[PDB]
Amino acid sequence: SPYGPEARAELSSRLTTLRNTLAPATNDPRYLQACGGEKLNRFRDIQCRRQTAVRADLNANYIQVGNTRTIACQYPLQSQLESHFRMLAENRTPVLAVLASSSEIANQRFGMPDYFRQSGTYGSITVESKMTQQVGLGDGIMADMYTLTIREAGQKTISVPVVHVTTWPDFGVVSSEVTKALASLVDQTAETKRNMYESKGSSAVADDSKLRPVIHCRAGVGRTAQLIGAMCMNDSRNSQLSVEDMVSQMRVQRNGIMVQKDEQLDVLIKLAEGQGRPLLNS
Numbered sequence: 001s002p003y004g005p006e007a008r009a010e011l012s013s014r015l016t017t018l019r020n021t022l023a024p025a026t027n028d029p030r031y032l033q034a035c036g037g038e039k040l041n042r043f044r045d046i047q048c049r050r051q052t053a054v055r056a057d058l059n060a061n062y063i064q065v066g067n068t069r070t071i072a073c074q075y076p077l078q079s080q081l082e083s084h085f086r087m088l089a090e091n092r093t094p095v096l097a098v099l100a101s102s103s104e105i106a107n108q109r110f111g112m113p114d115y116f117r118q119s120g121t122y123g124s125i126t127v128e129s130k131m132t133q134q135v136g137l138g139d140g141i142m143a144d145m146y147t148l149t150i151r152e153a154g155q156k157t158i159s160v161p162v163v164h165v166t167t168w169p170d171f172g173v174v175s176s177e178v179t180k181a182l183a184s185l186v187d188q189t190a191e192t193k194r195n196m197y198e199s200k201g202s203s204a205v206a207d208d209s210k211l212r213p214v215i216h217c218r219a220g221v222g223r224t225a226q227l228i229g230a231m232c233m234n235d236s237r238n239s240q241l242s243v244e245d246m247v248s249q250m251r252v253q254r255n256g257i258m259v260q261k262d263e264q265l266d267v268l269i270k271l272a273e274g275q276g277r278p279l280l281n282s
């Protein structure tokens with residue numbers, strides 16, 4: 001009954017009202033507007049909350065779910081790549097989790113540039129990519145890891161760990177087990193990198209807008225939100241945070257579409273159930 005169909009129908013009812021409420025109007029002041037006609041959002045109706053936006057020219061948002069601080073974004077457009085790399089380096093990114101699949105990146109129709117697996121130059125920024133480990137996550141899903149080295153004349157050179165999930169388990173107990181394994185890997189990768197910065201006395205440790213994990217799929221609202229939900233449930237600081245609370249917080253801080261599909265919410269419900277974590281606010 002706490003996790004039964006009645007409770008799930010009530011949770012879905014609240015979250016649907018919230019999505020409808022957050023739907024962008026034309027020139028909505030809640031949302032980042034493109035200036036001059038340059039494409040900002042990769043999808044028209046998947047917009048970027050202005051007050052938590054990381055950069056004026058990116059579809060990317062600071063997200064805090066309970067105590068867990070991240071950045072969720074869309075897969076950068078080709079025109080956004082230099083700005084994207086500057087965000088990653090400025091943030092001192094302890095891990096970048098890419099949940100777009102290999103076959104989606106390869107599909108040129110999608111306009112997803114292969115920016116973390118290839119070396120190249122983007123304006124004055126130079127990027128080197130070195131593949132490191134590969135970690136199985138269950139049911140044949142694989143994470144490819146990379147060290148992404150970002151160089152720019154007169155800027156501190158920054159190296160970003162990358163966790164690339166090459167295919168995705170859309171639904172089921174499989175998705176739930178794999179998500180939990182991915183959350184642990186991403187959080188472990190970030191802790192190792194953050195520890196390095198702390199051991200070198202980096203001032204970035206002081207700034208809570210910095211050292212955040214950066215997560216994106218294609219739109220940054222589906223697979224991305226399912227991962228962020230799992231990571232927040234892995235944080236020992238977030239006891240008694242409800243699934244309602246955590247999805248509502250994601251939606252107010254990025255857009256109403258966070259947790260896009262019923263199958264993604266149901267993974268989050270199952271993880272909460274395994275923890276005895278409440279679904280609803282009382």
Ligand code: VO4
Binds near residue numbers: 100217219222223260
């Ligand atoms: O690349 V996602 O369509 O599951 O926001």
